[PDB]
Structures are given as C-alpha cells and as structure tokens.
Design a protein around this ligand. Structure first.
Ligand SMILES: O=C(O)C(=O)N[C@@H](CSCc1cccc([N+](=O)[O-])c1)C(=O)O
Ligand SMILES: [Fe+3]
Length: 201
C-alpha cells in the first residue's frame, strides 16, 4: 500500500463536515485557537486547540498532554458527539474497533501555514492509531518512513478525507506543505484537521 498500516478513507467525513465545523467553532469559543511556540522558540504557523479529556500543548519548553488548557486555566472542552461518532466509525472501518481517543487536536491552517517534518511520538501507547480528518481547503501531505531521511511521498488531502494511521505508518515522519489560498464553502479560507489520539496511560 501507500503507507503500511494506513487506511485512507476519502470523503468519509464529507456528509458530517458541516456539523464537525460547527463543533470546531463551539470548542474554539471556549478554548480559542492559538499559535503555540515550539521548544526552539518559533511561533507555529498552524493555530491549534483541543477537546477531550487531554489536549496537546507545549509546556515549560517541552510538549505534553494536559487535562487543562494553559491559556484559559480551564479543562479543554468535552469531546463533541460528532467528533466522537465520526472517529469511532472511521477507526472501526479501518480495523481498530477498540480505539478510544481521549484527545483531539484541532489544527487550523491559514494560507501559507505548514507543519514541518516530524513524528508523533508523544503518546504512551504507539500501538494505538491516530485518526486524521481533513476539512476545508486541500493540503499536500508528505510522509516518509521510520527514518528522517526516508524518501518522501506526497498526497493531497481534501475536504472530508479521513486517514487512519496505524501499524508502521503510525511512526512515519510526516508534514504538511504550505497551504494554498482558496475558497471552500464551509470553512471559507482555511483548512482544519482533527487528529484523534489515545493520549492517556
Ligand atoms: O498534528 C500533527 O502532528 C499532524 O501531523 N497533523 C496533520 C494530521 S495527522 C498526520 C499523521 C498522524 C500520524 C502519523 C502520520 N503518518 O505516519 O504520516 C501522519 C495535519 O494537521 O493535517
Ligand atoms: Fe503529526
């Protein structure tokens, strides 16, 4: 396959998108999007927030999952029903019926925003997949392999696409290329990505 252990489900979230986006807005009304600072001192171009019991954040110049939003000093908003349902349906179709995320990181891309190449290794159990849902403007996703120098492959992720990153692919280096400007009827001028994680012990 494209990436061993990954399951791409194009347009899987297409019908759910309008509701998901309403729920992104609701979460953000409580824990606002913010551009976090990397441990290296750089302000991320991607803006982020979280919902669920745990939320990914930079903290004391490292990263961690925290039950509290350090910007509001309140818990991250509860996981919306629409998020919970979509993630479970996707995980199940992909062969991970027991996947129980307790964190959802919500990434917002304005034109030009990108993610540099990296691995997702902050979770306690790397056998749990990550479920990724793309909404709005299309992005070029790049992913390599288990080594930083593995050859990259590229794939366009479009509105409604869901990828379940399990098995070996769960540990691949990956990133997102600078978002091209455009219009989408539901998000207007941005892309959102939801990544569901099992972050608790
Ligand atoms: O927030 C992040 O760290 C991140 O990368 N977010 C991507 C979606 S998740 C893509 C992903 C997750 C886990 C494994 C692999 N992979 O092996 O390509 C890709 C995004 O904002 O579009
Ligand atoms: Fe990642």
């Amino acid at each position: 396959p494209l990436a061993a252990g990954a399951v791409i489900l194009r347009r899987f979230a297409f019908n759910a998108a309008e509701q998901l986006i309403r729920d992104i807005n609701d979460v953000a009304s409580q824990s606002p999007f913010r551009q976090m600072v990397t441990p290296g001192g750089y302000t991320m171009s991607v803006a982020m927030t979280n919902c669920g019991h745990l939320g990914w954040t930079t903290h004391r110049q490292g990263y961690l999952y925290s039950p509290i939003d350090p910007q509001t000093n309140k818990p991250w908003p509860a996981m919306p029903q629409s998020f919970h349902n979509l993630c479970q349906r996707a995980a199940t179709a992909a062969g991970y019926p027991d996947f129980q995320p307790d964190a959802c990181l919500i990434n917002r891309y304005a034109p030009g925003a990108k993610l540099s190449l990296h691995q997702d290794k902050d979770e306690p159990d790397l056998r749990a997949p990550i479920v990724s849902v793309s909404l709005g403007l299309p992005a070029i996703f790049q992913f390599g392999g288990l080594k930083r120098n593995d050859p990259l492959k590229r794939l366009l992720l479009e509105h409604g696409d869901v990828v379940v990153w399990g098995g070996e692919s769960r540990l691949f280096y990956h990133g997102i290329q600078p978002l091209k400007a455009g219009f989408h009827p539901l998000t207007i001028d941005c892309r959102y990505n939801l990544t569901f994680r099992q972050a608790g012990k």
